[PDB]
């Protein structure tokens, strides 16, 4: 009954996750919500920085999350590029000025500003959210048979 009750309360529980919880519903653009497959690559990036990069310290919260965000731009370019080229991100250390490491890629493939995620770039994004040996992601990416793990894993340091 888990997946179905999550089906009926979907619009509801994500409103609450956005309103009153630590790890918000990830797929939320400009206040209005959506799913991972409704969010464009550019939005995925511009949100990953909103939740994994600290503007006040101007520093990533972890090298693990910066590695996450980098391995994501890796496929972003792996998809939209036509032939084999050199990475626009050669060491993720470039992400230390993020809003420009974004433009650097999303000017090399302006298409990823308009087209949603390819579906193989969703389950990858998820297998990167449940990768061991990395700090769990500070948001909720999806509702499925692992929802509470996503919901209350490593939920102490936040204080």
């Amino acid at each position: 009954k888990l997946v179905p009750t999550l089906e009926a309360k979907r619009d509801y529980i994500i409103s609450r996750l956005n309103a009153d919880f630590q790890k918000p519903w990830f797929a939320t653009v400009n206040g209005q919500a959506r799913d991972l497959a409704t969010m464009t690559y550019e939005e995925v990036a511009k949100r990953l920085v909103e939740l994994m990069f600290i503007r006040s310290t101007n520093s990533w919260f972890d090298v693990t999350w910066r590695t996450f965000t980098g391995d994501f731009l890796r496929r972003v370019e792996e998809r939209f590029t036509k032939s084999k080229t050199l990475s626009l991100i050669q060491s993720y250390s470039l992400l230390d000025k993020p809003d420009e490491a974004i433009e650097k890629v999303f000017n090399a493939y302006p298409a990823a500003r308009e087209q949603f995620l390819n579906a193989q770039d969703i389950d990858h994004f998820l297998s990167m959210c449940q990768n061991p040996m990395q700090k769990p992601v500070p948001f909720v990416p999806v509702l499925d048979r692992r929802f509470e793990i996503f919901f209350k894993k490593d939920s102490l340091w936040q204080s």
């Binding site: 496929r75 370019e77 792996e78 998809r79 084999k84 080229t85 193989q120 389950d123 297998s127």
Partner: protein, 193 residues
């Protein structure tokens, strides 16, 4: 009968055999010594400085992935199209009465209508055409989760289930995809004997 010596004068350069055999015997020396000297100095550079910092110079180079498309018609802005049609056309047609194709598809000897227009217009398959003809011929499958423990997410063999990238699919399959598509000697097991 005429002879027509279209020879540049190669009957004059004397003892041409080894004069030739020397010119190339030198081009292998000057080639191979700069093969051997170059690799060891690059190898010298790896023991005084170590490859721990020399690996950051090995740049990361990305393989394109297959991103199929739907080929929707592009819509140029309104000023462009109000120009191509006669200016008097607007307000002049009962649009309820203008038929218009809105979708289309196909199942031919070349797969869908996207992967026949390739061997039709372009004579050969793209990457997005070779992955689709790989998927609709049951060569490659999908997989996400954990195979070999490691999380694999992407195309895989379908017979051996062993991971395969969309950059090594055109090399690995394009031979058979084209071997078994289009007008062919009739394969009996497609027609139950």
């Amino acid at each position: 009968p005429v002879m027509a010596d279209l020879n540049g004068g190669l009957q004059f350069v004397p003892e041409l055999k080894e004069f030739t055999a020397k010119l190339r015997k030198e081009l292998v020396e000057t080639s191979e010594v700069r093969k051997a000297v170059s690799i060891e100095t690059a190898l010298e550079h790896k023991v005084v400085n170590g490859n721990s910092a020399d690996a950051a110079y090995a740049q990361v180079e990305i393989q394109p992935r297959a991103n199929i498309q739907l080929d929707f018609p592009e819509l140029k802005p309104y000023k462009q199209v109000k120009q191509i049609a006669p200016a008097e056309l607007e307000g002049l047609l009962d649009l309820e009465r203008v038929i218009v194709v809105t979708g289309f598809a196909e199942v031919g000897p070349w797969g869908s209508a996207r992967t026949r227009w390739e061997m039709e217009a372009f004579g050969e398959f793209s990457l997005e055409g070779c992955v689709e003809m790989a998927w609709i011929m049951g060569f490659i499958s999908y997989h996400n989760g954990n195979l070999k423990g490691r999380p694999y997410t992407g195309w895989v063999d379908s017979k051996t289930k062993e991971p395969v990238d969309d950059k090594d699919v055109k090399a690995k399959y394009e031979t058979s995809i084209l071997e078994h598509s289009g007008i062919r000697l009739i394969e009996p097991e497609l027609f139950n004997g």
